[PDB]
Design a protein around this ligand. Structure first.
Ligand SMILES: C#Cc1ccc(NC(=O)CC[C@]23CN(S(=O)(=O)c4ccc(C(C)(C)C(=O)O)cc4)C[C@H]2C[C@H]2C[C@@H]3C2(C)C)cc1
Length: 375
């Protein structure tokens, strides 16, 4: 039947989409129960521990901590972020090729149990290091770069604050577009021309603003630092020649298991508005559907219910209504500009620095598909 609704105005809370921060976690927990203090210390001290060569031995001396004291969603998500960062640090070390193929059981077991409860793979994903990895400095001030911080970083100078928070702020900007989605579908059922037009224009304007928030990335991230340092800890063990069979989660699985590292495909924004605008469109469709299984399951169910709703695109073009066509086209254009900027960032922060020590084709093809969706 499509999107489930909490009331006449707001989508169901089962989708875990917040009115203010959207797909991001609202007011994330910063501290775990005292019981997990040893976990919190390691995660808070990851930069000096990796730098000093101490991280692995500190992890190796942790006791087994049960997850039963992680009683609510926010604490489980904080715990996943803490254990996820520790796992990446333990596996990659200093990033120079001295990798660990076995995650010690005292981390692997609670991490794998927690991940099973949340239906997330046992590797760091976007939902951890961006969507749950933030705080306000001043609770009474707004959600701005200057008034926020990340909870955890990997190395001093890795630009993880700039990379993660700017990404979060784009997610927060998109939240103003996401909350309009129910009005779009109500307007269509009611045949309310103006309500639909203004909904589409507000979506377009919020996506335009989200693109302006994205532009801040250059002011808080250094390309060399990103490519040579942060990217190490976002790397996974699926098709990776350094862990060709995967990672052994000691005490959970006998055999090694492959899980993919971070991908921009894990943000739900692009598919949210591709689906809404009917814009959605080989082996890349497999990788993209795979990245969907790295999103929180409720967000997956939102994306799926959205596809089950009537098509904005079909409604709009059948009206001989320039205003609706232009408003739809404004949304499409905003999405195209966001993809274009994504390609620029991939080129400046990944492709060039790599050249100095297939992807372009996939992304450029999806951008042109979007541009060909203009009516
Ligand atoms: C664990 C984990 C982990 C950590 C971070 C992320 N980040 C995202 O998913 C961000 C999504 C973004 C994309 N940009 S980005 O700067 O172009 C960007 C480019 C490349 C990548 C990586 C390295 C993961 C890759 O793909 O190789 C990540 C981001 C930032 C965001 C802003 C706009 C464009 C979307 C947006 C719509 C919200 C994923 C997994």
């Amino acid at each position: 039947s499509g999107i489930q609704m909490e009331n006449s105005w707001t989508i169901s809370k089962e989708y875990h989409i917040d009115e203010e921060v959207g797909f991001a976690l609202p007011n994330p927990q910063e501290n775990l129960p005292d019981f997990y203090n040893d976990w919190m210390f390691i995660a808070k001290h990851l930069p000096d521990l990796i730098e000093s060569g101490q991280l692995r031995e500190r992890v190796e001396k942790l006791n087994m901590l049960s997850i039963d004291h992680l009683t609510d969603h926010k604490s489980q998500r904080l715990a996943r972020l803490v254990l996820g960062c520790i796992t990446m640090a333990y596996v990659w070390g200093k990033g120079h090729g001295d990798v660990r193929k076995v995650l010690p059981r005292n981390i692997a077991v609670p991490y794998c149990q927690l991940s099973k409860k949340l239906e997330l793979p046992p590797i760091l994903v976007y939902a951890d290091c961006v969507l749950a990895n933030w705080k306000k400095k001043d609770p009474n001030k707004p959600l701005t770069y200057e008034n926020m911080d990340v909870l955890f970083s990997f190395r001093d100078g890795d630009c993880s604050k700039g990379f993660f928070l700017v990404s979060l702020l784009v997610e927060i900007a998109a939240a103003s577009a996401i909350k309009v989605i129910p009005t779009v579908f109500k307007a269509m059922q009611m045949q309310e021309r103006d309500t639909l037009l203004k909904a589409l224009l507000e979506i377009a304007s919020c996506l335009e603003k989200a693109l302006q928030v994205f532009h801040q990335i250059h002011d808080h991230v250094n390309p060399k630092a990103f490519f040579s340092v942060l990217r190490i800890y976002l790397s996974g063990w699926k098709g990776n020649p350094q862990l060709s069979d995967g990672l052994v989660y000691e005490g959970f699985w006998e055999d090694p298991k492959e899980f993919a590292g971070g991908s921009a495909g894990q943000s739900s924004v692009f598919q949210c508005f591709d689906v809404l605008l009917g814009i959605q469109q080989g082996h890349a469709a497999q990788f993209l559907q795979d990245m969907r299984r790295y999103m929180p399951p409720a967000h997956r169910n939102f994306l799926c219910s959205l596809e089950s709703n009537p098509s904005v695109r079909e409604f709009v073009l059948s009206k001989g209504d320039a205003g609706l066509r232009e408003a739809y086209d404004a949304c499409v254009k905003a999405l195209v500009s966001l993809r274009s900027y994504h390609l620029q960032i991939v080129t400046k922060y990944i492709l060039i620095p790599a050249s100095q020590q297939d992807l372009m084709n996939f992304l450029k093809t999806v951008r042109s598909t979007t541009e060909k969706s203009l009516l």
